[model samples]
Target: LYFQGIHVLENFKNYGLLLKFQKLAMTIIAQQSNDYDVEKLKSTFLVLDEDGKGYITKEQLKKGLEKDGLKLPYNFDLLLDQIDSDGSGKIDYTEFIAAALDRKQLSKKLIYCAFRVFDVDNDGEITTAELAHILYNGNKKGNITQRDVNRVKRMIRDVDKNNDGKIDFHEFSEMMKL
Candidate 1:
């Protein structure tokens, strides 16, 4: 278990439905992390994603955890419910890392860059428009999408603690902490 993700397993043990803001922030964290960490998680992903098709099924996740002997000490289903954020009946690669990420790696620079990705307008704040644009754009090639305007706003509203209709850098950073 030395090279394996002990923190990743612990992350699952400590958890189910994460905040949308947190999920997105973690997605950013997955990509922004150091090369060594990314390689580690990527290898862990392959461990869990045995099929190697970029995602894992419920049965596969269980089997993989057992295979690695890092099985969650908690109720699998409860934590699983949290990881399947898209409710696609499986865990995506990013979804796994989002939950697996250790808070120690969450940096101010990482959060700032993540916020900027969603705040495409350079406005200092992330609005529903920016979110919707980045999320459900015409480009089907992108990874994230809700396909519903209402749901898009709901995601923004999750982090827009001020209820001012947008997410600021402070609000974004707060979400990353979760």
Candidate 2:
């Protein structure tokens, strides 16, 4: 966990606003329990590159992700841009490994995106109401009460270090580790 903290902090320093951290302790536990297998990634890449070529096209990536039950949102071009470092419009083994190494970094980007979603006013923090909106308004499902709101409040309190009555990015980052 400490090492992960160092890694994240260094990333945060290097990337500045682009980096986000999650529940470090939980993620450390999870990482220890299930490490990434380089061989597995290579094999997966090989399978995706069905032409026995050294690289995969964007279409192949889309198909592979879909087959793996990983549904990417529309406009995956932005994602491809991140993975295709050379801008050759193809993902080679180097790019794939680089992407794998930065899996956590990608997670950070997603967290930042979610933070923007909850920070409706773009104030760099999320209020209880915003949390409720995310929980209840998404599917427009069951009712949400003050108790539910309070529960969310309590959860935030666990991470809210400064007692700001809301969850800031720092606090939010803590929740994302695992």
Candidate 3:
């Protein structure tokens, strides 16, 4: 709305700017959602009806994928029967969201706990070193090297607006509020 008229400038600036902003916003949203894959129709279950029609015809699924710029392989239909939970001719948003959001899996809270537990040092902030240490020990231990520690410190300093060197409870709470 801000750049309403100006037909010529629309192609050169407005549309391109809108696309860039859209991409950035999508990236942020995806990160917050843990980068969870929700494009099950494109990634899997191609034969399932995407319309929740209770039955997924091959043609219907193919058309759905095409709209999203995806082309399913001829053999992808193998998993359709198994993935189509409702036995509907089509896979609805519910089924797709389930696969994308992994609704049938463990709760989101559990996932958050896993992240918190990985944050050792009891510093209340989970740094990259902490994450790497968690990963290095297969997540059983939280010991990190000086290099990791320095990296964490640097990242926090650069990103943690207040120069606290640590993202404390208040900062974290504020982050969620935004």
Candidate 4:
């Protein structure tokens, strides 16, 4: 139920145009998709990854729309040339859940889903340490450099309220609301 047939097709034209932070947040939220959607995506990915390589090509990318039950002549040519922002011409594993990720995300559900992902133990808040763990998939052995350290610190600061150094749902929804 996460994606209706042809709904994900609309965003193919949007390509890599989503804003950076929003895209990052969605990638993580995409990681939280229900099992069925995840299975469907991976099944298609298995077919498209070109002999099961770590990545897939734009040519292979064209074939994916069909699995969504989209008809041919989808008119993807206009933006497919610029589809990948870095122009690497290879879609990595995470990119499967990244980008527009189907079309079922209501902005309301999306905002809350993102908080639950960051708010460990349903504490209704995200501490800087919790954010770091998530950013690194909870592996403390990230070998995080000083530069990496400050970037996530700043991510929290951008929405931090009352100098509390942690983000509550109140502070978080302010950013996700838009």
User: What would the TM-score be for candidate 1 when compared with the true structure?
Assistant: 0.66
Which parts of model 3 are misplaced by more than 4 Å?
1-64, 67-115, 121-123, 127-129, 135-143, 169-178
Give a tens-digit lDDT track for model 1, residues 101-144.
67667678767867777777788988766776665562223444
lDDT of 4 by residue, 37-152 (tens): 55566677677776778677767777777666877566665455444645566666556545435435335565677778777767877876666666655533345555555556
Query: What is the C-alpha lDDT profile of model 2 across 1-178, one tens digit per residue?
Result: 9989976765544342112122222223232323345445666878888998888898998999899999798989788888786678898766665565434543554456556666667889888767666555642244678966765665565667799878887677666543
Cα TM-score of candidate 2: 0.39
lDDT by candidate, in order shown:
0.69, 0.62, 0.47, 0.61
- Candidate 3 vs candidate 4, lDDT winner: 4
Candidate 3 minimal-lDDT segment of 10 residues: 18-27
> How do these models rank on lDDT, best leading?
1, 2, 4, 3
> How well does model 3 score by local distance difference test?
0.47
Best by lDDT: 1
Candidate 1 segments whose C-alpha is farther than 4 A from its true place: 1-21, 32-35, 138-158, 161-164
Q: Tell me model 4's lDDT, rounded to 2 decimals.
A: 0.61
Compute the lDDT of residue 65 as modeled in candidate 4.
70
* Span of ten consecutive residues with least summed lDDT in model 1: 10-19
Using TM-score as the measure, name the better of candidate 3 and candidate 4. 4
Candidate structures ordered by TM-score, highest first? 1, 4, 2, 3
Alpha-carbon error at 117 in model 4, in Å? 3.9
TM-score of each: 0.66, 0.39, 0.32, 0.57
Error of 2 at 1 (Å): 36
